[PDB]
Design a protein around this nucleic acid. Structure first.
Length: 300
RNA sequence: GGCCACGGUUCGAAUCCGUGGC
């Protein structure tokens, strides 16, 4: 029974949950989840948690992502992709200069409204559910930031490019907005998430074509997970304490590794075991004041 | 853990997580 994260590949077609089920089918379990959904029409990196690993999934939602996208100008749908049933073709007569101009005009920060077809919630129901019932929701915008755009390739009306964006950014909205700026409209047709944080699509595995063994081996152990984030070590004695509630104090730490305030921290004992993730209560300077407050404990 | 309500995450998560209650 392994416990950790699995960098999987979601083929174009099935939903993010269809991925989980596939996994939990192979590993014969139920403790399975993902740390970030991918629209069915898209494909790429999908962080999948196994057993105790599901507990750390929430930390991947804050990682930068890298997508390769291909939108089609002059196309518009209600879902912002090619799976929409209400399409509207529009005449596109813009110069490649006007296109690239619009594309890079988005590098930076802007307020992105979430597509009505999102998993966001309004009043106990999911937007995509409400949208299908005929009620479109207009949620408040989210200041999203586009870090950079590269490998732009223009072919007639099919524009394509790579982009790195902050967490919570919708590539569907990005395209729709670029199509607006261009007046002809735009719709995402192909979307490929090349990476989430440091997890590439190369390090990924197509759980749908692999066997249990193959899937098992590719699971990263809680220790090796969340490579980013500060890691502190505690004297082998204090371990039993931590595994039984108990906050962490100065006299329990053996190594520091500077960190912030409410910043998450990894807690290792001496034998080299992840004991728990905890939020700092201070900074990182030189009395038994609780210096770290538990945030999650692992009974692997 | 389980059973309810509410959120989260790039859309068909009841199924994963997180918050409240028991």
């Amino acid at each position: 029974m392994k416990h950790g994260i699995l960098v999987a590949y979601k083929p174009k077609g099935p939903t993010s949950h269809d991925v989980v089920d596939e996994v939990r089918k192979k590993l014969k379990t139920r403790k399975v989840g993902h740390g970030g959904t991918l629209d069915p029409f898209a494909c790429g990196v999908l962080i999948i948690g196994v057993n105790q690993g599901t507990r750390i999934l929430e930390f991947y939602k804050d990682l930068k992502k890298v997508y390769w996208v291909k939108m089609r100008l002059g196309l518009i749908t209600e879902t912002f992709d090619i799976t929409g049933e209400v399409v509207e073709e529009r005449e596109c007569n813009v110069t490649e200069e006007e296109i690239r101009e619009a594309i890079f005009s988005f590098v930076g920060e802007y307020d992105q409204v979430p597509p009505a077809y999102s998993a966001k919630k309004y009043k106990g129901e999911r937007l995509y559910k409400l949208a299908r019932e005929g009620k479109i929701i207009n949620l408040p915008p989210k200041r999203v930031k586009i870090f950079k755009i590269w490998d732009v390739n223009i072919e007639g009306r099919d524009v394509s490019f790579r982009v790195e964006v902050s967490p919570g950014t919708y590539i569907r909205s990005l395209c729709m907005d670029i199509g607006y700026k261009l007046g002809c409209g735009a719709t995402a047709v192909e979307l490929v998430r090349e990476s989430v944080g440091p997890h590439t699509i190369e390090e990924s595995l197509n759980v749908f074509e692999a066997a249990p063994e193959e899937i098992e081996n590719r699971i990263i152990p809680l220790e090796k997970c969340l490579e980013w984030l500060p890691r502190v070590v505690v004297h082998q004695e204090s371990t039993k304490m931590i595994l039984n509630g108990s906050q962490i104090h100065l006299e329990m730490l053996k190594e520091w590794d500077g960190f912030k305030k409410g910043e998450v921290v990894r807690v290792f004992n001496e034998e080299g075991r992840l004991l728990a993730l905890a939020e700092a209560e201070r900074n990182s300077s030189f009395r038994q004041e609780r210096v770290l407050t538990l945030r999650k404990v692992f009974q692997t």
